[PDB]
Design a protein around this ligand. Structure first.
Ligand code: HEM
Length: 418
């Protein structure tokens, strides 16, 4: 219906809708066409707002850099169809954000709330978790090795270690694993009963989680620890504690943001190594390559498929006239296969350097957890790879049919033990 839309319907459907993300050979050719022919253009398909599709690495950085011009707060920062956004608005007091977490905020609010934990998540602070992360990683590796050379790398291994890491970072006890899996896999899981009923279930379930998290907040105000829950519980702004709604959103955001992404990227690494056995040999003879392996797994997997922005003023990008109120989809996968930046970007190559990928985004909201993600993946692969003589896929990987946080959910493998 919007006269400015120039992206062919079939291409627009492929890049916007969830289904195509389940197959690399569906999604990546569509983005290649856009990068070649309509690098920044408008799409409008039935059931969605009109939107610009940012397919180029340069543009995704330019937009992400300027939160004053391209907003997280103003519209939904997640790519929902109109029906789902309206449902979200109806359970969130009219706001297009289900909780008050960092990705829902614009500066200066954003800057203040991110600032509460920014230092904790920097490499020097994160390095103190090394011993704990190594214990957690070894447990997951043992889990895999307990199989007689056959398992699902995701469901039998990679599902676990990153949740345990985010739990240790927060301060959630080991025994609460079931509740944390419910949080990230069930309540905030991918869909893949009336509206009133769904809304009732939502309000009940989130209240249950927030009651649970409130107990930690109270605990840490009397008995401080070096974990994130303690940091936030004991934080003040303008001389007062942060409201429970911001604290609990922060706990949920950290758990959900840090689990699937890391698991998925780990699966991506195993797919890459399975298809490229020489690279497994390389990482085994030179463990100092593992950080480069980790960055390549994140670039190539690109588990976060999109975030959205709303233009707050008329403005120009790649010679296009973006108008106030226009929504923009940021495609991290398309940026990560941009030929102007990467040679042979469809190839998994652990020696790729430099590797200036946007798997963690770029600019004001750039992944808070990026340093924790890189450290835990490094430690995991340091522990796993010496234990493996070989690894191969036993069947096709199954990827999540989503336009938000996807990548591998199931990675059937065979392996021989070193
Ligand atoms: C391979 C693993 C991961 C990937 C690919 C990833 C990716 C991303 C991306 C793309 C964003 C949006 C950035 C932007 O708008 O520019 C983001 C935001 C965020 N990530 Fe991650 N992430 C990963 C791991 C983690 C971990 C382990 C944590 C926490 C322990 C985490 C916490 C967050 C938080 C809190 C935000 C919101 C930050 C803000 O709005 O200021 N992520 N992540």
């Amino acid at each position: 219906m919007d006269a400015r839309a120039t992206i062919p319907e079939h291409i627009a459907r492929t890049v916007i809708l969830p289904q195509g993300y389940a197959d690399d050979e569906v999604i990546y050719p569509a983005f290649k066409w856009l990068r070649d022919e309509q690098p920044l253009a408008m799409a409008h398909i039935e059931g969605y707002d009109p939107m610009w599709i940012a397919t180029k690495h340069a543009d995704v950085m330019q937009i992400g850099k300027q939160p004053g011009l391209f907003s997280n707060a103003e519209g939904s920062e997640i790519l929902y169809d109109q029906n789902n956004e309206a449902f979200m608005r109806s359970i969130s007091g009219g706001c297009p954000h289900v909780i008050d977490s960092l990705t829902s905020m614009d500066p200066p609010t954003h800057t203040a709330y991110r600032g509460l934990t920014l230092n904790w998540f920097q490499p020097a602070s994160i390095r103190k978790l090394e011993e704990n992360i190594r214990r957690i990683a070894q447990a997951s590796v043992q889990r895999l090795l307990d199989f007689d050379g056959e398992c699902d790398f995701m469901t039998d291994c990679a599902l676990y270690y990153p949740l345990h890491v985010v739990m240790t970072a927060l301060g959630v006890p080991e025994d609460d694993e079931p509740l944390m899996l419910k949080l990230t896999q069930d309540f905030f899981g991918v869909h893949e009963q009336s509206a009133d009923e769904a809304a009732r279930r939502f309000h009940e379930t989130i209240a249950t989680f927030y009651d649970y998290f409130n107990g930690f907040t109270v605990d840490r105000r009397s008995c401080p620890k070096d974990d994130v829950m303690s940091l936030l519980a004991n934080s003040k702004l303008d001389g007062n504690y942060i409201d429970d709604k911001y604290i609990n959103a922060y706990y949920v955001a950290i758990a959900t943001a840090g689990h699937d992404t890391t698991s998925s990227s780990s699966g991506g690494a195993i797919i890459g190594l399975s298809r490229n056995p020489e690279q497994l040999a390389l990482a085994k003879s030179d463990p100092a390559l593992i950080p480069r392996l980790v960055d390549e797994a994140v670039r190539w997997t690109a588990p976060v498929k999109s975030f959205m922005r709303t233009a707050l003023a008329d403005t120009e990008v790649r010679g296009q006239n973006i108008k106030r109120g226009d929504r923009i989809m940021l495609s991290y996968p398309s940026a990560n296969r941009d030929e102007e930046v990467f040679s042979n970007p469809d190839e998994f190559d652990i020696t790729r350097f430099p590797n200036r990928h946007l798997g963690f985004g770029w600019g004001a909201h750039m992944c808070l957890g990026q340093h924790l993600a890189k450290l835990e993946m490094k430690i995991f692969f340091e522990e796993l790879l010496p234990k493996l003589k070989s690894v191969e896929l036993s069947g096709p990987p199954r990827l999540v049919a989503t336009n938000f946080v996807g990548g591998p959910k199931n990675v059937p493998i065979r392996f021989t033990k070193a």
